[PDB]
Amino acid sequence: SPTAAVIAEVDELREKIKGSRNSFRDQSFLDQLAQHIADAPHLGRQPIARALVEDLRGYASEPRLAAVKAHINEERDQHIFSLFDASYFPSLSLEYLTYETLPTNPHLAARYASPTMPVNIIASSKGFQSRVVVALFPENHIDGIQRGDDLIFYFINKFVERHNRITRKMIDAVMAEGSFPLLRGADDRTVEQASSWWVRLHEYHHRQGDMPIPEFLRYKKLKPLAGLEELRVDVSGMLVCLNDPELPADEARLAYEYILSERLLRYAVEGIPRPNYDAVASQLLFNYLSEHGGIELHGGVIRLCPELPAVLTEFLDRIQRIEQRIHTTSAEEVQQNLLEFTNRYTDYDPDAKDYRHIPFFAEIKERLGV
Amino acid sequence: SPTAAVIAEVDELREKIKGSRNSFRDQSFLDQLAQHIADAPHLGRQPIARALVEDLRGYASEPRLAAVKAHINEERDQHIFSLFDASYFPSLSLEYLTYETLPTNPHLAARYASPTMPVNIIASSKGFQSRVVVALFPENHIDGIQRGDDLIFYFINKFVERHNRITRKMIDAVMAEGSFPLLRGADDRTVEQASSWWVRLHEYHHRQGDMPIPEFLRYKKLKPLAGLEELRVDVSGMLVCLNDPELPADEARLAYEYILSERLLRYAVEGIPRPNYDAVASQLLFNYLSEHGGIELHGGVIRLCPELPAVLTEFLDRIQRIEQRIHTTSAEEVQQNLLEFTNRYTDYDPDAKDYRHIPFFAEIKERLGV
Numbered sequence A, B: 001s002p003t004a005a006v007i008a009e010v011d012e013l014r015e016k017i018k019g020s021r022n023s024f025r026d027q028s029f030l031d032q033l034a035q036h037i038a039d040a041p042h043l044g045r046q047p048i049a050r051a052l053v054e055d056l057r058g059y060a061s062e063p064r065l066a067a068v069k070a071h072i073n074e075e076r077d078q079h080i081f082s083l084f085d086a087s088y089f090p091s092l093s094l095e096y097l098t099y100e101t102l103p104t105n106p107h108l109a110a111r112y113a114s115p116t117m118p119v120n121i122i123a124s125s126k127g128f129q130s131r132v133v134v135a136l137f138p139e140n141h142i143d144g145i146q147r148g149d150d151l152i153f154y155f156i157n158k159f160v161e162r163h164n165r166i167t168r169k170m171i172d173a174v175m176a177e178g179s180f181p182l183l184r185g186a187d188d189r190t191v192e193q194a195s196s197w198w199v200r201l202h203e204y205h206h207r208q209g210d211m212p213i214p215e216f217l218r219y220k221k222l223k224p225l226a227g228l229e230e231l232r233v234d235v236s237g238m239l240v241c242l243n244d245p246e247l248p249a250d251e252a253r254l255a256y257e258y259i260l261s262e263r264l265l266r267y268a269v270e271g272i273p274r275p276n277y278d279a280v281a282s283q284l285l286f287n288y289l290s291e292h293g294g295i296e297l298h299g300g301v302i303r304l305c306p307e308l309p310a311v312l313t314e315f316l317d318r319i320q321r322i323e324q325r326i327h328t329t330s331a332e333e334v335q336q337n338l339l340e341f342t343n344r345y346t347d348y349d350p351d352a353k354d355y356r357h358i359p360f361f362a363e364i365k366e367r368l369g370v
């Protein structure tokens, strides 16, 4: 396999530089790395490798990976190759992958446009094989730069895997019979499509509203607030799938079921021993929906009420009322009010200043090992 | 078994009351629970069950489980049975176990005395089978009360299990040849004796120093500070094993190796996606020892320096210098200085106000699945 030969070369260079992350911007190291990439029999031939070599060789004057990113962003081919430094994707150093794109609904791509690339990984170097690495953002490159039109990649094959391994099991164990009818027995190509809708809507809505990110990112990194912002955009996407009549009805209801099942179940159990940011927000959703009539618990089993669309709309309306006050108060004051809202519906420990898994999902974590 | 019949009856009542935690102090609920316990053909006739029934029936005027705790604290037999409400042990509701005590070193128990009970669980109800539940504290009972002479139980069999599942594989992969020779191939009884020394020294040293717990507990629940207090006491126990000549020399060195291996390795990888309280402090230890000459990294593997006992003494001295200022400054000022010390040697994200696994242990988590 030609691609296996290329990836073998990347993986061997990756091994050699594993102890040198502190030198990844040192020009002496970069010159040596660049020279080794250039001399790699198969890798060095590749246009994208020549671009990186040029970027690396010039880094002391221009600390940018402009040529590599121009290649990627223009989709000159379906390869990604660069030097990465992403603190939350620690497995990534010198990495390579080949991807395949997924079909997109024309109305979705036009009306909710963003530079998002839902793809399947065909082959990749070792750092990309970690289950941690589910996406790739422009600032993950060593230059740390992101522009609004840089392509952002989501590895949909990994979300399909997570849905099949975790979400399906949770639907069967936690939800009333018939809760997610379109998802039952749905094949991978179907979940793949719904997942691609989900990430497209996710990226689009992050940039909408009165406190979009990246503009207000540094106010939305505390665990509960990072989770709440995730939930704001995924509820927004849920409601688009319910309300936008220009989306194909069958595909939109599937995407709705998918986003709802992911946020109501899989994300709700994430994190050990404490909920991570996604789980805090998903437990907020669980308790809000329970309290406000969107779901019901009958003997430990979740029923989706027919009124759930109205309650999801009320929930998003409530978040938007809190954020709208950015126009008349400080971002710090809005933060405090977002936290107060979160804490009314989660298990916040004031002395630890952190959260506990609410008992409902703690028991599910125990029962299913999730 | 008669015991098997008792526990079956407990598990069945536990199932009946699973949805009712919000009523666990309601007298109408307690009157009914007490009656069902009293009528349990096997469980109801146990002396500890008579004690719980009396406590529960009297709870409206005496919100304490005094008769149950008197039975347990006086070790009238080796059964534990109560109604529990421990937010960090959410699996515990109505629970029952039988335990076996372990050999005890006379000097250790006299010089470092505490009401600690290192025991093995022989049989138990479902709540006690959770791997989360490694110990049982007096305030875990629904009355929420603790007294300085209440017995505190540690389930040593679970620490043996964790040692053999995580620590052993970590020693092999991460430690230089010959780092922990007394632990190599050690049988479960040997690990059990080391673990019982560890928990005894742990409980003892929590009450020593200038900021002991429980007195200063509410200042030591923030994740980094909770971990740093764990590490203060375990480094103290480490040094006791090295320095106290009236402890048996073979058992003392074994306990030293055990405690060091647990804090250097097993606790260092705890928590997903972020380190938990133990892991933050263990990564503080790792980086402190690296920079101050107590360990060295050669080929991704940790060598323990002969000078390590002196560097551990320096580390504990440093913690004790910060805590000593409680006598001239506020608890809050001490907290800030404990955090500043922690953050110098850990990966703190100031925008998230939380920690990331340091790269050394992130890589080990990926490689070994820990």
Ligand SMILES: C[C@H](O)[C@H](O)[C@H]1CNc2nc(N)[nH]c(=O)c2N1
Pocket: A137, A152, A202, A203, A206, A213, A220, A221, A225, A226, A227, A229, A230
């Ligand atoms: C909101 C929360 O901080 C969450 O992790 C954000 C972070 N930054 C992001 N940036 C982009 N482009 N897309 C995303 O989905 C997110 N997720």
Ligand SMILES: C[C@H](O)[C@H](O)[C@H]1CNc2nc(N)[nH]c(=O)c2N1
Pocket: B137, B152, B202, B203, B206, B213, B220, B221, B225, B226, B227, B229, B230
């Ligand atoms: C230090 C940190 O708070 C840790 O979780 C403390 C908490 N309270 C405790 N209380 C007792 N009796 N024994 C312990 O070991 C601890 N651990």
Ligand SMILES: CC[C@H](C)[C@H](N)C(=O)O
Pocket: A134, A202, A230, A278
């Ligand atoms: C919804 C955005 C991403 C995919 C999600 N927070 C995750 O880490 O899986």
Ligand SMILES: CC[C@H](C)[C@H](N)C(=O)O
Pocket: B134, B202, B230, B278
């Ligand atoms: C040594 C204290 C306890 C055992 C440790 N923090 C744990 O949760 O395993």
Ligand SMILES: [Fe+2]
Pocket: A202, A206, A230
């Ligand atoms: Fe996001």
Ligand SMILES: [Fe+2]
Pocket: B202, B206, B230
């Ligand atoms: Fe402790």
